Amino acid sequence: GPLGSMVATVKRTIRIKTQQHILPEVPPVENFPVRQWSIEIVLLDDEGKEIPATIFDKVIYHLHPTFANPNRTFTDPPFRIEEQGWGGFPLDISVFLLEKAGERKIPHDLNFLQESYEVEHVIQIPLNKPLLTEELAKSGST
Amino acid sequence: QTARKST
């Protein structure tokens, strides 16, 4: 299964939730409509119900470099970001575990394929920081 | 809906 230091971890599923719609008052860019889009992040428990992702004390969205100040930091669940843009792009979402337990770079794809869509990612989380272990208890076994 | 940027 896992090996070495990675044995002392548990897995959680986080769900990234994306929404987007066209802003008609914003002029299209080269005929492409400008859309308002939003990303949020939740945690899933052992039953698959959505609970606040309190296991992170910080989330940073690393946006495409066409945005001003493309690295956007949020500290409260659900770490909701909102922007306007003309194009889809892969972006990295850095999530920072409580108690400096570690940064995880989760691959997201911002796209306009649907009005809304959800994507799940499995992350490994260590069990050696008491406050994080205690918080992890709310979303499933540890 | 398939509009995308570069990298």
Side-chain angles (χ1 to χ4, degrees), chain A residues 3 10 14 52 72 81 99 102 107 109 118 122-123 127 129 142:
Chain A
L3 229 54
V10 294
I14 66 178
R72 313 278 176 94
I81 182 174
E99 296 299 79
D109 194 80
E118 295 81 28
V122 178
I123 67 173
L127 304 166
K129 307 291 185 209
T142 53

Side-chain angles (χ1 to χ4, degrees), chain A:
Chain A
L3 229 54
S5 65
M6 280 202 195
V7 175
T9 63
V10 294
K11 299 177 179 190
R12 290 286 186 274
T13 298
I14 66 178
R15 178 179 288 155
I16 301 172
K17 310 166 82 173
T18 306
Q19 305 197 357
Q20 59 87 19
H21 62 79
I22 294 171
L23 295 176
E25 71 274 12
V26 193
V29 186
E30 290 174 333
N31 289 327
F32 287 71
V34 165
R35 303 167 182 268
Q36 183 137 332
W37 53 261
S38 67
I39 312 174
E40 306 178 320
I41 301 179
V42 300
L43 183 53
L44 307 180
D45 57 30
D46 45 20
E47 312 199 5
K49 145 188 198 189
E50 299 188 358
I51 69 178
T54 64
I55 53 165
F56 309 134
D57 57 19
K58 185 142 87 170
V59 164
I60 314 181
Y61 301 94
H62 304 296
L63 307 180
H64 188 289
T66 43
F67 297 81
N69 166 30
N71 307 292
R72 313 278 176 94
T73 288
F74 298 90
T75 58
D76 310 311
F79 311 104
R80 184 183 162 82
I81 182 174
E82 293 185 51
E83 264 293 340
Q84 319 180 356
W86 63 80
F89 55 96
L91 74 92
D92 275 40
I93 313 184
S94 283
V95 301
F96 288 85
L97 292 161
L98 293 186
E99 296 299 79
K100 286 192 243 292
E103 175 190 12
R104 303 287 179 267
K105 287 222 237 182
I106 290 131
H108 190 48
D109 194 80
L110 185 280
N111 63 80
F112 309 141
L113 293 168
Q114 326 198 66
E115 186 172 331
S116 75
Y117 60 96
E118 295 81 28
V119 182
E120 318 188 349
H121 295 277
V122 178
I123 67 173
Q124 267 160 342
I125 304 165
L127 304 166
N128 62 348
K129 307 291 185 209
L131 288 188
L132 176 63
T133 306
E134 294 210 350
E135 204 68 24
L136 282 171
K138 310 170 169 176
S139 59
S141 52
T142 53

Side-chain angles (χ1 to χ4, degrees), chain A residues 64 66 88 90 109 112-113, chain B:
Chain A
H64 188 289
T66 43
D109 194 80
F112 309 141
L113 293 168
Chain B
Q1 292 171 103
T2 63
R4 300 184 65 78
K5 298 193 185 210
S6 299
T7 297

